[PDB]
């Protein structure tokens, strides 16, 4: 069994990990890293590391980088043993922006399959945060096998138009969960089409920057509808058909049959780049009832 | 009247080890987490927590010494204290000998547990892995040394992630194999005074582990444990041996006694041998044998 560790670093990443835990993401070890002990006391993560205590990131990515570097041997000892490490953060602050590349580089040095899952900040958060996020993403990309970047701006095209600010950030938490769980559930709770760790590692190793799409549907033709929503997701930036590497997971209950799964795969193949490498896997989750959830990770544009 | 056993994890590696013990449900001991870094704190659900941080051995040593009164108060009343800085290194390497010294001056049977890193990890100057081991040895009654390199000889071809996971698991057993023998009823129970007799002032100890299922599982697991690469072919010369067999409540006396007879044959003729068993019905039909060997011929 592959050992998967999910790191949330900075306030946004720790909030995302708390949401993952609250929604019952299974089969992974949760690690919260932050510069604020009180926030960490309230987190339900398995492992909690308070860093940068001497300095305390004032949203300063350089302080976040130095706090993580100062703690690097400690982080390494926590990550040792993982086959796969997710590094999750909201980019644009100090602790996550500056610290996430340190965590990922430790995981990549150890040879764990290292997947970043991060948000770009909303435009309304201001240009300094956008610039910081841009620099942090560039740094993180060099240290991850795959770095999934979720543009928060595109979340506002989805969901409800009467959303509040707090609502918007909870949707960000949820999409970071979706990005992690859409991959890890393939490994931890496979359905009819088993895509195991070595397959995931084959397509995500050295893949570079990636985008994600998500779709959910119920009822008649649910699998086709969920796949069409996913591949047209605003989070994929109208770029699905340019991607040459695609990992797709289809989750449902035991009532989800191979015919439905296959028609979803056919729809996605028809839409994909002519030379795309596409891996399809399924997830058994009886808590979904009659919902089907499709997650697409797209890389190699 | 019952043995009071306190398990101290110091520094990031040691606190993480204690957290793993707690997560795995190690019973019958008090867990103590001591943080030695000013810059970072690994949180813990240990019973007792002390942050002395006010990544180097001298820093951790002075941090612990500065807090010696507080550490002593935490350890007072223990009959047995385990101290470990766990995997890796940092300030915990410097703090651990200070904790051990305080425990021993209180009169507790003081058992250190230290890992030698894998050779592929490289080495940080001053010879500080070996210097950390030497410092802890001078402050402990017994120092259990786990040579991680020997894990690459145990079982298929070990992967890097496997190697690290195995290291974590055997470190946990450096504590649990002994503490369960003392704290947890089995068919064959031991006297703490005999444990203290064999481990007081013993110095370096090595550990062996084995497991087996099916018929003859007790003998098979014991043979594996006494031949374990982690014992460095030292079993035949050992003058103090502790052996614990963990297994289901249905394990028979004859089968258990076969394992006890094997370790007696394998140890030095003049060895002290403490033998017992632990009921762990969650192992199913598997048995797990731990051997601790100290002294030379
Ligand atoms: N998913 C999520 N993102 C957040 C939350 N709060 C803020 N963010 C985003 O994360 C970015 C970094 O903020 P934060 O993680 O608090 O800063 P840090 O602790 O200094 O890394 C912000 O610019 C927001 O886009 C949250 O509760 N959840
Ligand atoms: O969760 C905590 C809180 C602390 O005060 C602490 C102190 C020392 C060591 C570990 C610790 O973990
Ligand atoms: O975690 C483990 C797994 C085993 O292989 C084992 C075997 C013998 C003794 C203790 C043991 O602890």
XYZ file of C-alpha atoms and ligand atoms in Angstrom:
650
model
C 0.000 0.000 0.000
C 1.370 3.393 -1.025
C 1.813 5.813 1.867
C 0.340 9.222 1.019
C 0.931 12.359 3.067
C -1.037 15.602 2.478
C 0.697 18.758 3.694
C -1.242 22.005 4.123
C 1.110 24.942 4.621
C 0.043 28.475 5.574
C -3.427 29.516 6.694
C -5.100 28.641 3.401
C -3.437 25.244 3.123
C -4.274 24.357 6.740
C -7.898 25.417 6.166
C -7.999 23.233 3.066
C -6.634 20.267 5.034
C -9.271 20.844 7.738
C -11.948 20.689 5.022
C -10.439 17.463 3.649
C -10.647 15.968 7.140
C -14.166 17.239 7.737
C -15.311 15.681 4.426
C -13.785 12.326 5.334
C -10.935 12.051 2.890
C -9.457 8.676 3.835
C -6.250 6.759 3.339
C -3.837 9.691 3.797
C -1.861 11.257 6.637
C -2.601 14.976 7.140
C 0.211 17.389 8.077
C -0.422 21.041 8.977
C 2.486 23.513 8.878
C 1.962 27.127 9.855
C 3.508 30.065 11.662
C 0.540 30.441 14.052
C 0.266 28.029 16.967
C -3.347 28.931 17.816
C -4.560 28.168 14.293
C -2.736 24.836 14.534
C -4.268 23.936 17.903
C -7.690 24.103 16.237
C -6.641 21.971 13.259
C -7.573 18.295 13.234
C -4.482 17.261 11.246
C -2.525 14.136 12.282
C 0.761 16.070 12.490
C 1.129 19.768 13.291
C 4.345 21.767 12.985
C 4.615 25.371 14.166
C 7.461 27.074 12.276
C 9.175 30.469 12.255
C 8.649 31.050 15.987
C 11.706 33.300 16.243
C 10.436 35.583 13.457
C 6.733 35.283 14.400
C 4.246 35.582 7.340
C 3.244 39.197 7.464
C 2.315 37.903 4.021
C 6.105 38.063 3.448
C 7.112 35.040 1.290
C 10.762 35.515 2.265
C 9.898 35.043 5.944
C 7.845 31.950 5.021
C 10.730 30.554 3.007
C 13.195 31.067 5.837
C 10.816 29.554 8.411
C 10.455 26.389 6.321
C 14.178 26.211 5.531
C 14.981 26.605 9.223
C 12.699 23.645 9.886
C 13.846 21.557 6.923
C 15.324 18.619 8.826
C 12.207 18.406 10.915
C 9.938 18.513 7.855
C 12.109 15.818 6.224
C 11.782 13.536 9.217
C 7.991 13.930 9.067
C 7.820 13.165 5.335
C 10.283 10.186 5.364
C 8.469 7.027 4.341
C 5.910 8.601 2.037
C 5.517 7.272 -1.493
C 3.469 10.331 -2.432
C 3.366 13.831 -0.930
C 0.792 16.531 -1.707
C 1.767 20.089 -0.874
C -1.350 22.308 -0.625
C -1.472 26.083 -0.071
C -3.256 29.238 -1.057
C -0.596 31.141 -2.994
C -0.081 34.852 -2.415
C 0.525 34.987 1.359
C 3.835 34.530 3.107
C 3.938 31.107 4.807
C 2.441 29.040 1.985
C 3.987 31.034 -0.875
C 7.486 30.918 0.612
C 7.326 27.565 2.395
C 5.581 25.298 -0.122
C 8.655 24.982 -2.427
C 10.764 23.930 0.551
C 8.327 21.171 1.504
C 8.007 19.989 -2.090
C 11.772 20.009 -2.656
C 12.220 17.816 0.444
C 9.608 15.388 -0.851
C 11.230 15.450 -4.332
C 14.708 14.965 -2.852
C 13.402 11.932 -1.042
C 11.975 10.659 -4.335
C 8.303 10.732 -3.235
C 5.893 11.464 -6.050
C 5.410 15.142 -5.260
C 2.144 16.825 -6.267
C 1.482 20.490 -5.560
C -2.136 21.618 -5.383
C -2.416 25.368 -4.943
C -4.757 28.252 -5.632
C -3.962 31.505 -7.329
C -5.606 34.304 -5.329
C -8.712 36.174 -6.393
C -7.994 39.330 -8.319
C -9.825 41.332 -5.670
C -7.065 40.408 -3.193
C -4.730 42.910 -4.821
C -1.707 42.920 -7.106
C 0.924 42.307 -4.424
C -0.711 38.985 -3.570
C -1.035 38.118 -7.264
C 2.639 38.920 -7.874
C 3.682 36.935 -4.807
C 1.560 34.010 -5.953
C 3.121 34.156 -9.401
C 6.623 33.987 -7.919
C 5.613 31.235 -5.485
C 4.065 29.145 -8.257
C 7.201 29.490 -10.362
C 9.281 28.320 -7.407
C 6.942 25.466 -6.527
C 6.776 24.222 -10.127
C 10.511 23.465 -10.068
C 10.150 21.259 -6.967
C 6.980 19.314 -7.860
C 6.502 16.374 -10.194
C 3.088 17.864 -11.045
C 1.850 21.256 -9.828
C -1.919 21.670 -10.129
C -2.792 25.360 -10.087
C -6.419 26.344 -9.428
C -7.317 29.903 -10.549
C -9.629 31.214 -7.839
C -10.969 33.799 -10.277
C -12.550 30.968 -12.266
C -14.331 29.602 -9.183
C -16.581 32.654 -9.320
C -17.919 31.525 -12.696
C -19.065 28.318 -10.942
C -21.444 27.826 -8.028
C -23.791 30.566 -6.815
C -23.748 34.240 -7.836
C -24.857 35.479 -4.373
C -21.652 34.066 -2.801
C -20.001 36.007 0.037
C -16.251 36.410 0.615
C -16.245 33.680 3.246
C -18.284 31.501 0.849
C -15.727 32.108 -1.896
C -12.854 30.930 0.253
C -14.775 27.841 1.388
C -15.252 26.986 -2.302
C -11.482 27.339 -2.675
C -11.024 24.937 0.231
C -13.404 22.540 -1.480
C -11.621 22.634 -4.860
C -8.271 21.954 -3.205
C -9.905 18.949 -1.568
C -11.330 17.930 -4.965
C -7.867 18.075 -6.505
C -6.305 15.898 -3.819
C -9.146 13.402 -3.402
C -9.688 12.981 -7.126
C -6.183 11.503 -7.265
C -5.753 9.808 -3.906
C -9.079 7.963 -3.975
C -7.879 6.200 -7.147
C -5.175 4.630 -5.008
C -6.950 4.238 -1.680
C -10.405 3.157 -2.731
C -10.361 1.904 -6.345
C -13.510 0.753 -8.081
C -13.987 -1.379 -11.208
C -11.082 0.274 -13.018
C -8.105 0.076 -10.690
C -5.475 2.728 -11.368
C -2.857 1.979 -8.758
C 0.132 3.943 -7.538
C 2.605 2.852 -10.201
C 0.200 4.071 -12.929
C -0.350 7.440 -11.286
C 3.404 7.818 -10.784
C 3.927 6.985 -14.451
C 1.761 9.846 -15.676
C 2.402 12.450 -12.962
C 6.203 12.103 -12.659
C 7.972 15.109 -14.144
C 4.748 16.333 -15.756
C 5.067 19.985 -14.725
C 2.241 22.501 -14.429
C -1.314 21.200 -14.578
C -4.900 22.383 -14.442
C -7.914 20.576 -13.058
C -11.569 20.260 -13.957
C -14.417 18.856 -11.890
C -17.954 17.772 -12.714
C -20.800 16.173 -10.788
C -24.161 14.870 -11.949
C -27.005 12.578 -10.918
C -29.762 10.724 -12.653
C -30.119 9.769 -16.281
C -26.852 10.117 -18.185
C -25.049 11.252 -15.004
C -21.609 10.009 -16.136
C -21.721 11.812 -19.485
C -22.956 14.991 -17.854
C -20.285 14.910 -15.109
C -17.557 14.307 -17.712
C -18.754 17.140 -19.958
C -18.868 19.554 -17.002
C -15.376 18.499 -15.920
C -13.726 18.926 -19.315
C -15.419 22.279 -19.856
C -14.657 23.467 -16.338
C -13.646 27.144 -16.092
C -10.737 25.889 -13.947
C -9.236 24.251 -17.083
C -8.971 27.677 -18.806
C -10.413 26.392 -22.108
C -7.226 24.332 -22.411
C -8.358 20.707 -22.024
C -7.976 19.948 -25.739
C -4.349 21.130 -25.681
C -3.312 18.792 -22.909
C -1.177 15.835 -23.845
C -1.276 14.198 -20.411
C -4.661 13.603 -18.713
C -5.594 11.653 -15.602
C -9.331 11.211 -15.106
C -11.073 9.715 -12.090
C -14.744 8.760 -12.045
C -16.253 8.206 -8.613
C -19.630 6.668 -7.817
C -21.370 4.064 -5.722
C -21.565 0.352 -6.445
C -24.491 1.037 -8.785
C -22.166 2.824 -11.255
C -21.645 0.319 -14.052
C -18.848 -0.198 -16.548
C -21.044 0.945 -19.441
C -21.577 4.341 -17.773
C -17.892 4.643 -16.877
C -16.889 3.775 -20.422
C -19.216 6.265 -22.093
C -17.678 8.976 -19.914
C -14.227 7.855 -21.027
C -15.332 7.871 -24.675
C -16.707 11.424 -24.376
C -13.400 12.581 -22.878
C -11.264 10.798 -25.482
C -13.295 12.442 -28.262
C -12.585 15.858 -26.736
C -8.910 15.377 -25.918
C -5.792 16.312 -27.850
C -5.297 13.759 -30.683
C -2.009 12.579 -29.149
C -3.033 12.736 -25.499
C -1.981 10.054 -23.056
C -5.146 9.595 -20.954
C -5.474 7.272 -17.968
C -9.000 6.501 -16.710
C -9.611 5.153 -13.226
C -12.631 4.734 -10.990
C -13.358 5.176 -7.291
C -15.947 3.334 -5.204
C -17.714 5.682 -2.780
C -21.135 4.474 -1.660
C -21.663 7.692 0.266
C -22.211 9.371 -3.096
C -25.653 7.820 -3.516
C -26.563 8.311 -7.166
C -24.019 11.054 -7.773
C -21.074 10.568 -10.134
C -18.035 12.851 -9.626
C -15.504 13.263 -12.451
C -12.116 14.879 -11.861
C -9.726 15.663 -14.746
C -6.075 16.625 -14.246
C -4.531 18.021 -17.450
C -0.829 18.601 -18.114
C 1.669 18.807 -20.983
C 0.000 21.614 -22.914
C 3.848 -0.434 43.448
C 3.511 -1.138 39.705
C 6.505 -0.026 37.614
C 6.040 3.608 36.579
C 7.443 3.886 33.015
C 7.881 7.290 31.375
C 8.782 7.476 27.662
C 10.496 10.754 26.748
C 10.692 11.915 23.142
C 13.021 14.886 22.776
C 13.497 17.065 19.693
C 11.525 16.739 16.495
C 12.496 13.136 15.838
C 11.792 12.082 19.412
C 8.435 13.843 19.682
C 7.437 12.356 16.322
C 8.361 8.892 17.616
C 6.256 9.436 20.741
C 3.372 10.629 18.545
C 3.631 7.375 16.559
C 3.608 5.370 19.800
C 0.473 7.183 20.883
C -1.153 6.677 17.497
C -0.377 2.973 17.587
C -1.900 2.606 21.039
C 1.172 1.766 23.095
C -0.241 1.258 26.608
C 0.948 1.259 30.201
C 3.403 4.182 30.048
C 3.373 7.971 30.475
C 4.420 9.861 27.328
C 6.512 13.021 27.670
C 7.283 15.343 24.713
C 10.180 17.810 25.064
C 10.688 20.409 22.338
C 14.286 21.667 22.082
C 14.081 24.097 19.123
C 13.463 27.798 19.521
C 12.341 28.155 15.916
C 9.824 25.323 15.525
C 7.554 23.148 17.617
C 6.173 19.757 16.669
C 2.883 19.474 18.513
C 2.040 16.323 20.427
C -0.826 14.602 22.210
C 1.627 13.410 24.891
C 0.394 13.420 28.498
C 3.105 15.880 29.514
C 4.734 18.456 27.256
C 7.645 20.796 27.910
C 9.022 23.345 25.428
C 12.608 24.113 26.434
C 13.476 25.756 23.069
C 14.989 29.157 24.001
C 19.655 22.503 14.788
C 22.737 21.646 16.794
C 23.623 19.301 19.685
C 25.172 22.012 21.885
C 22.012 24.109 21.538
C 19.822 21.201 22.576
C 22.144 20.313 25.458
C 22.121 23.832 26.879
C 18.353 24.154 26.379
C 17.794 20.956 28.388
C 20.329 21.867 31.076
C 18.687 25.288 31.467
C 15.424 23.438 32.190
C 16.893 20.696 34.390
C 14.742 21.501 37.418
C 11.571 21.325 35.328
C 12.659 18.115 33.623
C 13.526 16.518 36.953
C 10.062 17.315 38.307
C 8.473 15.655 35.263
C 10.541 12.483 35.754
C 10.258 12.193 39.537
C 8.558 8.980 40.609
C 9.513 6.926 37.557
C 10.944 3.451 37.998
C 11.932 3.361 34.351
C 12.566 6.146 31.816
C 13.042 5.674 28.074
C 14.706 8.581 26.257
C 14.894 8.946 22.495
C 15.624 11.672 19.950
C 14.157 9.377 17.269
C 15.217 9.431 13.649
C 17.243 12.198 12.096
C 19.004 14.580 14.397
C 19.101 18.173 15.429
C 18.933 19.572 18.934
C 17.310 16.433 20.316
C 20.704 14.701 20.059
C 22.051 17.165 22.590
C 19.025 17.170 24.848
C 18.616 13.420 25.177
C 21.751 12.805 27.319
C 20.675 15.572 29.715
C 17.276 13.948 30.182
C 18.904 10.532 30.668
C 21.350 11.903 33.244
C 18.506 13.433 35.268
C 16.484 10.211 35.109
C 19.448 8.165 36.272
C 20.271 10.532 39.123
C 16.666 10.122 40.299
C 17.293 6.396 40.423
C 15.196 5.380 37.416
C 16.295 2.530 35.184
C 17.218 4.693 32.220
C 17.034 3.207 28.721
C 18.098 5.253 25.730
C 17.024 4.337 22.221
C 19.177 5.718 19.383
C 19.215 5.083 15.626
C 22.323 5.008 13.559
C 21.430 6.597 10.235
C 21.665 4.745 6.962
C 25.036 5.219 5.327
C 23.331 6.676 2.243
C 22.244 9.669 4.369
C 25.826 10.955 4.567
C 27.371 12.472 7.661
C 27.421 15.910 9.367
C 30.824 16.997 10.787
C 32.209 16.543 14.301
C 31.126 12.895 13.846
C 27.956 13.913 15.550
C 25.833 10.788 15.042
C 28.492 8.692 16.794
C 29.138 11.537 19.235
C 25.432 11.682 20.059
C 25.457 7.922 20.642
C 28.483 8.146 22.922
C 26.973 11.005 24.958
C 23.686 9.151 25.440
C 25.496 5.937 26.341
C 27.375 7.669 29.141
C 24.067 8.880 30.654
C 21.943 5.716 30.253
C 21.829 2.391 32.055
C 21.230 0.660 28.721
C 21.442 2.240 25.272
C 19.553 0.337 22.580
C 21.289 1.112 19.297
C 19.379 0.440 16.061
C 21.767 0.294 13.054
C 19.418 1.292 10.217
C 21.901 -0.062 7.613
C 21.017 -3.572 8.754
C 17.375 -3.077 7.726
C 18.464 -3.419 4.105
C 19.175 -7.097 4.867
C 15.768 -7.952 6.373
C 12.893 -9.841 4.745
C 12.743 -8.975 -0.944
C 14.778 -5.956 -2.116
C 14.006 -3.002 0.180
C 12.862 0.306 -1.476
C 13.918 3.713 -0.117
C 10.457 4.485 1.251
C 10.310 0.934 2.665
C 13.676 1.466 4.327
C 12.464 4.631 6.080
C 9.179 3.045 7.139
C 10.984 -0.002 8.504
C 13.315 2.255 10.462
C 10.342 4.008 12.073
C 8.704 0.707 12.969
C 11.750 -0.853 14.579
C 12.391 2.315 16.608
C 8.844 2.061 17.963
C 9.593 -1.540 18.887
C 12.770 -0.497 20.735
C 10.270 0.773 23.266
C 7.148 -1.349 22.876
C 8.738 -4.796 22.906
C 10.166 -4.144 26.372
C 7.356 -2.043 27.843
C 4.612 -4.526 26.851
C 6.602 -7.374 28.419
C 6.559 -5.415 31.696
C 3.120 -3.765 31.618
C 0.822 -6.133 29.704
C -0.285 -9.537 31.000
C 0.790 -12.650 29.157
C 0.941 -16.335 29.952
C 4.563 -15.819 31.106
C 5.058 -12.657 33.152
C 8.262 -11.156 34.490
C 9.413 -9.204 37.546
C 10.483 -5.600 36.893
C 13.268 -6.135 39.412
C 14.750 -8.755 37.089
C 14.519 -6.341 34.166
C 16.296 -3.702 36.262
C 18.875 -6.314 37.242
C 19.741 -7.102 33.630
C 19.581 -3.523 32.256
C 21.147 -1.418 35.042
C 24.628 -0.367 33.927
C 24.516 -2.771 30.969
C 25.640 -0.273 28.295
C 25.033 -0.946 24.607
C 22.190 -3.233 23.646
C 20.991 -4.442 20.254
C 17.528 -5.578 19.215
C 16.235 -8.400 17.056
C 12.709 -8.905 15.795
C 10.880 -11.757 14.133
C 7.370 -12.702 13.154
C 5.715 -15.831 11.809
C 2.287 -17.404 11.277
C 1.024 -20.955 11.183
C 2.325 -24.003 12.950
C 5.640 -23.618 14.733
C 5.168 -19.855 14.435
C 6.692 -19.233 17.901
C 9.891 -21.123 17.057
C 10.080 -19.626 13.561
C 9.640 -16.057 14.834
C 12.193 -16.605 17.579
C 14.748 -18.018 15.122
C 14.258 -14.979 12.915
C 14.664 -12.617 15.865
C 17.849 -14.198 17.205
C 19.378 -14.188 13.723
C 18.217 -10.648 12.953
C 20.822 -8.486 11.163
C 19.990 -5.768 13.709
C 21.736 -7.911 16.347
C 24.963 -7.767 14.295
C 25.685 -11.484 14.961
C 26.160 -10.583 18.657
C 23.554 -12.896 20.197
C 26.040 -15.717 20.879
C 28.198 -13.387 22.986
C 25.432 -11.602 24.876
C 25.438 -11.878 28.678
C 22.030 -10.293 29.157
C 19.070 -11.259 26.950
C 15.453 -10.179 27.138
C 12.930 -11.997 24.963
C 9.240 -11.221 24.628
C 6.731 -13.195 22.536
C 3.574 -11.290 21.646
C 0.667 -13.318 20.334
C -2.875 -14.537 20.778
C -4.215 -15.830 24.105
C -4.444 -19.307 22.520
C -0.682 -19.649 22.028
C 0.202 -22.814 23.931
C 2.757 -23.265 26.695
C 4.607 -25.988 24.822
C 5.026 -23.743 21.761
C 6.080 -20.784 23.865
C 8.546 -22.920 25.777
C 10.156 -24.157 22.522
C 11.028 -20.545 21.741
C 12.378 -20.037 25.258
C 14.522 -23.110 24.896
C 15.901 -21.866 21.560
C 17.052 -18.519 22.903
C 18.784 -20.239 25.840
C 20.683 -22.447 23.412
C 21.585 -19.448 21.275
C 22.734 -17.123 24.032
C 26.021 -17.324 25.878
C 25.983 -20.095 28.530
C 26.607 -17.535 31.249
C 23.865 -15.156 30.068
C 21.120 -13.811 32.247
C 17.917 -14.403 30.304
C 14.596 -12.734 31.008
C 11.755 -14.360 29.055
C 8.056 -13.643 28.863
C 4.984 -13.284 26.718
C 2.321 -10.703 25.974
C -1.306 -11.314 25.016
C -2.136 -9.272 21.880
C -5.258 -10.848 20.376
C -5.165 -8.280 17.569
C -2.237 -10.147 15.980
C -4.549 -12.941 14.886
C -2.485 -16.046 14.264
C 0.768 -14.093 13.947
C 3.350 -13.982 16.711
C 5.920 -11.204 17.110
C 9.169 -11.865 18.989
C 11.504 -9.148 20.299
C 15.006 -9.919 21.572
C 17.196 -7.396 23.370
C 20.850 -8.432 23.759
C 23.486 -6.711 25.940
C 26.997 -7.580 27.235
C 29.814 -9.441 25.488
C 31.914 -12.607 25.830
N -8.417 27.587 0.504
C -8.324 28.735 1.248
N -7.603 29.779 0.766
C -7.484 30.913 1.514
C -8.148 31.035 2.815
N -7.859 32.287 3.298
C -7.077 32.916 2.365
N -6.863 32.082 1.315
C -6.063 32.281 0.103
O -4.712 31.921 0.384
C -3.825 32.984 0.055
C -2.715 32.996 1.106
O -3.298 33.331 2.341
P -2.825 32.551 3.671
O -2.617 31.037 3.451
O -3.693 33.021 4.839
O -1.400 33.246 3.911
P -0.166 32.453 4.621
O -0.505 31.864 6.008
O 0.758 33.646 4.930
O 0.402 31.533 3.637
C -4.700 34.219 0.083
O -4.106 35.285 -0.714
C -6.054 33.712 -0.395
O -6.154 33.531 -1.821
C -8.939 29.865 3.253
O -9.561 29.874 4.344
N -8.969 28.806 2.450
O 1.071 20.231 21.286
C 1.997 20.691 21.841
C 1.962 21.866 22.615
C 3.082 22.172 23.398
O 3.004 23.136 24.388
C 4.238 21.332 23.318
C 5.402 21.570 24.103
C 6.483 20.698 23.964
C 6.444 19.616 23.092
C 5.319 19.377 22.325
C 4.213 20.265 22.476
O 3.109 20.006 21.735
O 5.887 -3.253 13.342
C 6.216 -4.390 13.484
C 6.127 -5.293 12.424
C 6.815 -6.503 12.483
O 7.398 -7.021 11.321
C 7.328 -6.923 13.746
C 7.920 -8.210 13.897
C 8.414 -8.603 15.140
C 8.342 -7.739 16.239
C 7.765 -6.481 16.087
C 7.253 -6.076 14.814
O 6.684 -4.817 14.672
